[PDB]
C-alpha cells in the first residue's frame, strides 16, 4: 500500500483484507489477552496455582507478536482507519502480558533482536522528536512524527516500562546496548519535559508519567553517579573499557547524561523552590515532571538503600534515607499547599497519586506526630482538591 499508494491510487484491492484485519483480529487479540493475562505471565512464580503455566515457546511467540505489531504501528497512525487507538490498546495489553525474564534467558535470536530493535526504534523516534521540536518547527513530516509520538509512542513505552518496573524484569531485560538505547530514551524524555517550547504544553503530563514509569523500570542509579561502581548491572562495569570505548559511549559514567542533574542538586532545588513558594504556572516543569520522577526513583531504590541492607553497607548502589523521603514528602505537601490557593488544578491530584508509594513506605509511626500538619492543613483549608490516602 505504501509502495503503490503514491503513484496512481489510494484505494487498493486488499481493502477487504485490511478491513477484516481491523474489524476482527485486533479486537479479539485485545479481549483474549485481557481475559488470559495471567496465563502467559505465570512462569515459575506460581500465580493461579490451579494451573496454567504457559510454555516458553508461547511466551516467545507472544513477544514476537508484540514486536511485529509495534513495527506495524510505527509511523503509521494516520494510515489506520481511526483504530490506531485499538492498536495502542492491543500493544498495551501485550506489554502487560510480556514475560521478559523467561523470554530473554530462553528465547530465539530473532525475537531477542526484534525486541532490541523495537527499543532502538523507539529511542531513534524520540531523538527525531527532539531534533524537530527544538531546532525547527517549520518543515508535514515532522508534524506527523510528533503526532505519532504523542498519540502512540508515549503510552506504549509507559505501559511497557511500568510492567518491567513492577515485575522487576529490568535486571534481565536491559543488559547490553539496550542500556545505551534506554539512556538515549531517558535523555529524550528529560529534555522534552524540561523543554521551553509551547508545543510540549499539551503533552507535559504524558511525558512526565512515561518518564516516571521509566524511573521505576530503570535498574541503574542514574541520579547518583558516584556509587555506580558498586552496581553490578551497570553497562560500565559489565562492558569493560575496551568494549565501552568501541561503543559510542562518553567513557565517563558521570558525563553519560549531562543535562539531567544529580539527585542531590535536584533535591536542594526542590526544597529551595518549596521554601520560595513560587506559583505553579511559572515553572510547570518541576511539579509536573520532576517530582513524580523523584518519587518513582526513590521508591524503587529504597530497598537497595543502606537502611534496608545494613550488611554490605558502603557497597550500596544508592544512598537513600528515611529522612530523604520524609523531606521529599514534606516539600511536596508544602508546595501543594502554597499553590493550593491560586485557581488549583488537577495536577495536585496527579502528584498525590504519584506520591502515594512514598507515603506507603513512610512509616505510620512517622505519619503520626509528623504529618499531622498535613491533615490539619487539609481540614483548616475550606476546600482542598488533594485526596490524601
From Swiss-Prot:
Signal peptide: none annotated. The modification Phosphoserine is found at residue 5. Detected in heart muscle (at protein level). Heart muscle, brain (cerebellum and hippocampus) and placenta. Channel activity is modulated by phosphorylation. Phosphorylation is increased in failing heart, leading to calcium leaks and increased cytoplasmic Ca(2+) levels. Induction: By TGFB1. It comes from the Eukaryota. It is found in: Sarcoplasmic reticulum membrane. The calcium release channel activity resides in the C-terminal region while the remaining part of the protein resides in the cytoplasm. Belongs to the ryanodine receptor (TC 1.A.3.1) family. RYR2 subfamily. Homotetramer. Can also form heterotetramers with RYR1 and RYR3. Interacts with FKBP1A and FKBP1B; these interactions may stabilize the channel in its closed state and prevent Ca(2+) leaks. Interacts with CALM and S100A1; these interactions regulate channel activity. Identified in a complex composed of RYR2, FKBP1B, PKA catalytic subunit, PRKAR2A, AKAP6, and the protein phosphatases PP2A and PP1. Interacts directly with FKBP1B, PKA, PP1 and PP2A. Interacts with SELENON. In cardiac muscles, identified in a complex, composed of FSD2, CMYA5 and RYR2. Cytosolic calcium-activated calcium channel that mediates the release of Ca(2+) from the sarcoplasmic reticulum into the cytosol and thereby plays a key role in triggering cardiac muscle contraction. Aberrant channel activation can lead to cardiac arrhythmia. In cardiac myocytes, calcium release is triggered by increased Ca(2+) cytosolic levels due to activation of the L-type calcium channel CACNA1C. The calcium channel activity is modulated by formation of heterotetramers with RYR3. Required for cellular calcium ion homeostasis. Required for embryonic heart development. It is linked to Ventricular tachycardia, catecholaminergic polymorphic, 1, with or without atrial dysfunction and/or dilated cardiomyopathy: An arrhythmogenic disorder characterized by stress-induced, bidirectional ventricular tachycardia that may degenerate into cardiac arrest and cause sudden death. Patients present with recurrent syncope, seizures, or sudden death after physical activity or emotional stress. CPVT1 inheritance is autosomal dominant. This is Ryanodine receptor 2. The gene is RYR2. The chain holds residues 2943 to 3337 of 4967 of the full protein.
Amino acid at each position: 500500500f505504501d509502495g503503490g499508494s503514491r503513484g496512481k491510487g489510494e484505494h487498493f484491492p486488499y481493502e477487504q483484507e485490511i478491513k477484516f484485519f481491523a474489524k476482527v483480529v485486533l479486537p479479539l487479540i485485545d479481549q483474549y489477552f485481557k481475559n488470559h493475562r495471567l496465563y502467559f505471565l505465570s512462569a515459575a512464580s506460581r500465580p493461579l496455582c490451579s494451573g496454567g503455566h504457559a510454555s516458553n515457546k508461547e511466551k516467545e511467540m507472544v513477544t514476537s507478536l508484540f514486536c511485529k505489531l509495534g513495527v506495524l504501528v510505527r509511523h503509521r497512525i494516520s494510515l489506520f482507519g481511526n483504530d490506531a487507538t485499538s492498536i495502542v490498546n492491543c500493544l498495551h495489553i501485550l506489554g502487560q502480558t510480556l514475560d521478559a525474564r523467561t523470554v530473554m534467558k530462553t528465547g530465539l535470536e530473532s525475537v531477542k533482536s526484534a525486541l532490541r530493535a523495537f527499543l532502538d526504534n523507539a529511542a531513534e523516534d524520540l531523538e527525531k522528536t527532539m531534533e524537530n521540536l527544538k531546532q525547527g518547527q517549520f518543515t508535514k513530516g515532522v508534524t506527523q512524527i510528533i503526532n505519532y509520538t504523542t498519540v502512540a509512542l508515549l503510552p506504549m513505552l509507559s505501559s511497557l516500562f511500568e510492567h518491567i518496573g513492577q515485575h522487576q524484569f529490568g535486571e534481565d531485560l536491559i543488559l547490553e546496548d539496550v542500556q545505551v538505547s534506554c539512556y538515549r530514551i531517558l535523555t529524550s524524555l528529560y529534555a522534552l519535559g524540561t523543554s521551553k517550547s509551547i508545543y510540549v504544553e499539551r503533552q507535559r503530563s504524558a511525558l512526565g508519567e512515561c518518564l516516571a514509569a521509566f524511573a521505576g523500570a530503570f535498574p541503574v542509579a542514574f541520579l547518583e553517579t558516584h556509587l555506580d561502581k558498586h552496581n553490578i548491572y551497570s553497562i560500565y562495569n559489565t562492558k569493560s573499557s575496551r568494549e565501552r570505548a568501541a561503543l559510542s559511549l562518553p567513557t565517563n559514567v558521570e558525563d553519560v547524561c549531562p543535562n539531567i542533574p544529580s539527585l542531590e542538586k535536584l533535591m536542594e532545588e526542590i526544597v529551595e523552590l518549596a521554601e520560595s513558594g513560587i506559583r505553579y504556572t511559572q515553572m510547570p516543569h518541576v511539579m509536573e515532571v520532576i517530582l513524580p520522577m523523584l518519587c518513582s526513583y526513590m521508591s524503587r531504590w529504597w530497598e537497595h538503600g543502606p537502611e534496608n541492607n545494613p550488611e554490605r553497607a558502603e557497597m550500596c548502589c544508592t544512598a537513600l534515607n528515611s529522612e530523604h523521603m520524609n523531606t521529599l514528602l514534606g516539600n511536596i505537601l508544602k508546595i501543594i499547599y502554597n499553590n493550593l490557593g491560586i485557581d488549583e488544578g488537577a495536577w495536585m491530584k496527579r502528584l498525590a497519586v504519584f506520591s502515594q508509594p512514598i507515603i506507603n513506605k513512610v512509616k505510620p509511626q512517622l505519619l503520626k506526630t509528623h504529618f499531622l500538619p498535613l491533615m490539619e492543613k487539609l481540614k483548616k483549608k475550606a476546600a482542598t482538591v488533594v485526596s490524601e490516602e
